[PDB]
Short mmCIF file of C-alpha atoms in Angstrom, two decimals:
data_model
loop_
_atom_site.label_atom_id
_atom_site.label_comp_id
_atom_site.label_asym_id
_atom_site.label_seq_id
_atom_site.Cartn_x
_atom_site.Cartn_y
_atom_site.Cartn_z
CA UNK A 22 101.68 55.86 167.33
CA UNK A 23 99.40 56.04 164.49
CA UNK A 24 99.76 56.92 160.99
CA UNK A 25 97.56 58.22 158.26
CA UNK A 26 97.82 57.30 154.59
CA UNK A 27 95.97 59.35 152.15
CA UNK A 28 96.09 58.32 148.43
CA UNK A 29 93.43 57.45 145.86
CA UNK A 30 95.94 54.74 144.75
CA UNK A 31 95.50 51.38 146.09
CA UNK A 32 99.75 50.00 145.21
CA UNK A 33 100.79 53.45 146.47
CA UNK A 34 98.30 53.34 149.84
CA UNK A 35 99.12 49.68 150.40
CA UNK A 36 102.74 49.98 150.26
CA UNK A 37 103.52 52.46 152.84
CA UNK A 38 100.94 51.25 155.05
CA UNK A 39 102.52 47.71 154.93
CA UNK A 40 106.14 49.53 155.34
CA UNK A 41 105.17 51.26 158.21
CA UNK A 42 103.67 48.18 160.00
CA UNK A 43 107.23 46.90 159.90
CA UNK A 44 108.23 49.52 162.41
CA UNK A 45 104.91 48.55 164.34
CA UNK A 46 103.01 52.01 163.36
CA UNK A 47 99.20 51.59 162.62
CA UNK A 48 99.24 52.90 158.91
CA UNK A 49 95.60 53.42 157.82
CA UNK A 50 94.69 53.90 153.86
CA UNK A 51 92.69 56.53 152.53
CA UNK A 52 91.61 58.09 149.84
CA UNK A 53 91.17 62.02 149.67
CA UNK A 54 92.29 64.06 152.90
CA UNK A 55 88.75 64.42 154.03
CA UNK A 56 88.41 61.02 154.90
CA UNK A 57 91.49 62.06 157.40
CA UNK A 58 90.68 65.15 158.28
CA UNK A 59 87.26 63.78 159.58
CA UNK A 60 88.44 60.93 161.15
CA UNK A 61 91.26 62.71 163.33
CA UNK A 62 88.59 64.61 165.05
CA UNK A 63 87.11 60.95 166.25
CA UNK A 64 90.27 59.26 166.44
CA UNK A 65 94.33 60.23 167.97
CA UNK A 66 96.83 60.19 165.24
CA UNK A 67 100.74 61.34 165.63
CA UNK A 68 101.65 60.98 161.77
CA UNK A 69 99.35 62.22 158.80
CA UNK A 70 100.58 62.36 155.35
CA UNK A 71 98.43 62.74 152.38
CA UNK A 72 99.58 62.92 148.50
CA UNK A 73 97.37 65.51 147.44
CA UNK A 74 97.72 68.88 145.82
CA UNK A 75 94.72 70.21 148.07
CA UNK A 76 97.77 69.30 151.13
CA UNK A 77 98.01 72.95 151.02
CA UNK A 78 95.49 74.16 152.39
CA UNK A 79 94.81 70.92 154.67
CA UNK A 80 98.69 71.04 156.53
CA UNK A 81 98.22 74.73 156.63
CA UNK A 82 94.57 74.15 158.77
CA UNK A 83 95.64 71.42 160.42
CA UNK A 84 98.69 73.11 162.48
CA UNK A 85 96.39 75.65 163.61
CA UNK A 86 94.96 73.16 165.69
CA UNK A 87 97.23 70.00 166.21
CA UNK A 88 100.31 71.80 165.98
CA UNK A 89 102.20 68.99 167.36
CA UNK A 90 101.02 65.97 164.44
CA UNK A 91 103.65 65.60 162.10
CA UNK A 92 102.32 66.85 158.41
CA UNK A 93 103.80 65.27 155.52
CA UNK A 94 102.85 66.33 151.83
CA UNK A 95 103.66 64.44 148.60
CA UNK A 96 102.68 65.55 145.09
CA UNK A 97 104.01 63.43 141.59
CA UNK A 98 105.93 67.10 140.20
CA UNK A 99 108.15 67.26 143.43
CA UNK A 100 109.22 71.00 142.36
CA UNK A 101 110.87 73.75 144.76
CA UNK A 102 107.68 75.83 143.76
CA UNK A 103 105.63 73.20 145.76
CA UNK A 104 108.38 72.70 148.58
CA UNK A 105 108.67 76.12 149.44
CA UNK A 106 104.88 76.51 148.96
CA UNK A 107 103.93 73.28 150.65
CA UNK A 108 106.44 74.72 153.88
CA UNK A 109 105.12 77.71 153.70
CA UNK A 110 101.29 76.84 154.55
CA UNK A 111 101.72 74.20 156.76
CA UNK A 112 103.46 70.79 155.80
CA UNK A 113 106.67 69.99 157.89
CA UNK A 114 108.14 67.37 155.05
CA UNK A 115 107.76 67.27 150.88
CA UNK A 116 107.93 64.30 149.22
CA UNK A 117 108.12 63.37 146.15
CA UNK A 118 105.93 60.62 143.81
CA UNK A 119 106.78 57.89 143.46
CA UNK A 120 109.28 58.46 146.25
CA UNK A 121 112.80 57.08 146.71
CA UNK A 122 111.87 54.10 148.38
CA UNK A 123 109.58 52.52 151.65
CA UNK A 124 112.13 52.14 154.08
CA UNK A 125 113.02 55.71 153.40
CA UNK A 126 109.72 57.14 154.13
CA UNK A 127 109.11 55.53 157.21
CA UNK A 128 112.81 56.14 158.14
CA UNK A 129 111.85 60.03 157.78
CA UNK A 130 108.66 59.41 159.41
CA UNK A 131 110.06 57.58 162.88
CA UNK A 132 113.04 60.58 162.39
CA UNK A 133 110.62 63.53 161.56
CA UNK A 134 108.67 63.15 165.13
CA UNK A 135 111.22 61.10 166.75
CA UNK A 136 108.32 62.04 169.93
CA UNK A 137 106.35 59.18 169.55
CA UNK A 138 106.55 55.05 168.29
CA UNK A 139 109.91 53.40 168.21
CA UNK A 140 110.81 49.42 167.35
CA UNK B 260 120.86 82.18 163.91
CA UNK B 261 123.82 80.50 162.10
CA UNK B 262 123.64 78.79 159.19
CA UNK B 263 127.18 76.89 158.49
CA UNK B 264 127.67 75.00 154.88
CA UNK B 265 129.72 71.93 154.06
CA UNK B 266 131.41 71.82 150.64
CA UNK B 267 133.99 71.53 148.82
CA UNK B 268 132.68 72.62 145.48
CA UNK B 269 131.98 76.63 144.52
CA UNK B 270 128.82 76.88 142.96
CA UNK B 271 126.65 74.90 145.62
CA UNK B 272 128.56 77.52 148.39
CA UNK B 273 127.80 80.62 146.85
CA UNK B 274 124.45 79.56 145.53
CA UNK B 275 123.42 78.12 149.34
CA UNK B 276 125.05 81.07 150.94
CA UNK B 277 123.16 83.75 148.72
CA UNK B 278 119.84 81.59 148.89
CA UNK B 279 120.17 81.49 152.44
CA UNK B 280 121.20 85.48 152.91
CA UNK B 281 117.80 86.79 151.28
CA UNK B 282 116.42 85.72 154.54
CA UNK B 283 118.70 86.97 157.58
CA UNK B 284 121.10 83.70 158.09
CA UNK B 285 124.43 83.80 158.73
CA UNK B 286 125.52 81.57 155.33
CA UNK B 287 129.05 80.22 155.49
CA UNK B 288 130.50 78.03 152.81
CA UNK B 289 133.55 75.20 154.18
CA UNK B 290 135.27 72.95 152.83
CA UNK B 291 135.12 69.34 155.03
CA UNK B 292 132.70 68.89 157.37
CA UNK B 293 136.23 68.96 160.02
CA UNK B 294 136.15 72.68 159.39
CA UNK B 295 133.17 73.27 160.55
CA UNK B 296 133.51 71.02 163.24
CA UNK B 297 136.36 72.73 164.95
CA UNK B 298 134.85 76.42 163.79
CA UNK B 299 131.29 75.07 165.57
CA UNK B 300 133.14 75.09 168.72
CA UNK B 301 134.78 78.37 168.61
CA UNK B 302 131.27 80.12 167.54
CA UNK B 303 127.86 79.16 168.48
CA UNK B 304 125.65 78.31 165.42
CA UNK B 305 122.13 76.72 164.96
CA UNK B 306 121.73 75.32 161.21
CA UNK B 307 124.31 73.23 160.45
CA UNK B 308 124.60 71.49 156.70
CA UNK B 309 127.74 68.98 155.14
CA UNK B 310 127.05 67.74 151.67
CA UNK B 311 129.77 65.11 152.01
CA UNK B 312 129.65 61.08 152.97
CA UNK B 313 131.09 61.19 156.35
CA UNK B 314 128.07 63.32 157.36
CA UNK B 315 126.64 60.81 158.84
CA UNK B 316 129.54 60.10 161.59
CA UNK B 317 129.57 63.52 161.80
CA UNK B 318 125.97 64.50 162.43
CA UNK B 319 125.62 61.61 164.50
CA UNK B 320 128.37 62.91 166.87
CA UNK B 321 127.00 66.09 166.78
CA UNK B 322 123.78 64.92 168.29
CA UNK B 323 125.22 63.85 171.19
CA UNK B 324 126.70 67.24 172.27
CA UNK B 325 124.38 69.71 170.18
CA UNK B 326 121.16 67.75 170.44
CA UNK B 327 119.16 71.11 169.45
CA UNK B 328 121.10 72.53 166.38
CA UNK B 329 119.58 71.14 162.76
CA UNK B 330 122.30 68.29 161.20
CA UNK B 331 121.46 68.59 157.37
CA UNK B 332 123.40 65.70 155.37
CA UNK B 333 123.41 65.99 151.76
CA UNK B 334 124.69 63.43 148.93
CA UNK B 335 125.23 63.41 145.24
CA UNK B 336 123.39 59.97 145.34
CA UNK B 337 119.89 60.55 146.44
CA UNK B 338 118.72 56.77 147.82
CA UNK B 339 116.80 55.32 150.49
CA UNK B 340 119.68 53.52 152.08
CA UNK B 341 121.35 56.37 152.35
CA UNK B 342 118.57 58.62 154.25
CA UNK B 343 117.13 55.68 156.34
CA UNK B 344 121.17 54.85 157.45
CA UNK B 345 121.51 58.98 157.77
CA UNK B 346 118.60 59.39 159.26
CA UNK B 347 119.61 56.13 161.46
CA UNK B 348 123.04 58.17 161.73
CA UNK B 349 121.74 61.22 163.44
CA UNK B 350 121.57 63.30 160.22
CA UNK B 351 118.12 65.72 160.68
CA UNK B 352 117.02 65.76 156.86
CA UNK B 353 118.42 64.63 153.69
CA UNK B 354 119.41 66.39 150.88
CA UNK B 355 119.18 64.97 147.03
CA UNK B 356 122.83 66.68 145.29
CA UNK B 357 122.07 68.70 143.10
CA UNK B 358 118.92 69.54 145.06
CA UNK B 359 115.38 70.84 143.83
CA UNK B 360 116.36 74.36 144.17
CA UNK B 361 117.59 77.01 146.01
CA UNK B 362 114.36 78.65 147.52
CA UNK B 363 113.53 75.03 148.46
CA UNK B 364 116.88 74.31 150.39
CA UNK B 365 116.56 77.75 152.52
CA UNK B 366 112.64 77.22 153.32
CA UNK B 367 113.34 74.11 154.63
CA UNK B 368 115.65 75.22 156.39
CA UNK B 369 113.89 77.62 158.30
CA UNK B 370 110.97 75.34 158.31
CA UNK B 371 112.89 72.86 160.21
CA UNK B 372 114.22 75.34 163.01
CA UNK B 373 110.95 77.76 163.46
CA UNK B 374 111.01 77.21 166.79
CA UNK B 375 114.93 79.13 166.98
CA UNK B 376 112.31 82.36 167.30
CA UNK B 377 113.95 85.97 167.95
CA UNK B 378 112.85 87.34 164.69
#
């Protein structure tokens, strides 16, 4: 299983990627979704979660073609507005920024697909 | 589809059973998650949600007969131990008490079970 990291932030970025290694998940950082977006046509991801408010659009693309990948979308206002929007295009899972913890996201990662990478 | 709700309180039943109504669920409001354990087995349901701490016992049991319906586990204490060890459990998602909103409980909801079809 691989999964994608997309933040500008380098703390942010760096953190997750390093939490999800724990699990043994590739985590790759990034910066905007592009970079992802991109890249997954070269490369085989499972898990692709970006913290961007252009998410949108990119979750709501992205399941028209790998409908399987798990999308995750995180913003720094984690509002119902942007929840139910966010659902609505595309994104399977919100969360929010910062977000409760590491182990938590991962957790919800490994438990969102649950089809792919296990410890 | 069934939707079946876990709480003792009054305002997060009504509120969750309206929210849930304005799209086509059937919304009902328990008490402990034991209700709607031994109701579950009388009636066939498909969106199952306990806001109480021995959700995850409970979801995680329910997983191993009712591996398809949706266990949502919700606490008044949203933290990372308690959604990895839910998660961990057999709870689906996790839900912060009070929660982000209404509209955002419901879309997830159906965001998690689009695959239940039969519009």
């Amino acid at each position: 299983m691989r999964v994608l990291l997309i933040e500008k932030n380098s703390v942010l970025g760096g953190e997750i990627e390093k939490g999800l290694n724990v699990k043994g998940f590739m985590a790759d950082v990034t910066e905007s979704l592009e970079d992802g977006e991109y890249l997954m046509d070269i490369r085989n991801y499972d898990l692709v979660m970006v913290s961007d408010k252009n998410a949108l659009s990119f979750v709501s693309r992205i399941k028209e073609k790998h409908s399987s990948i798990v999308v995750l979308v995180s913003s720094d206002n984690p509002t119902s507005e942007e929840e139910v929007h966010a659902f609505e295009q595309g994104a399977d899972d919100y969360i929010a920024k910062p977000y409760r913890s590491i182990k938590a996201l991962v957790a919800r990662i490994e438990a969102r697909l649950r089809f792919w990478g296990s410890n």
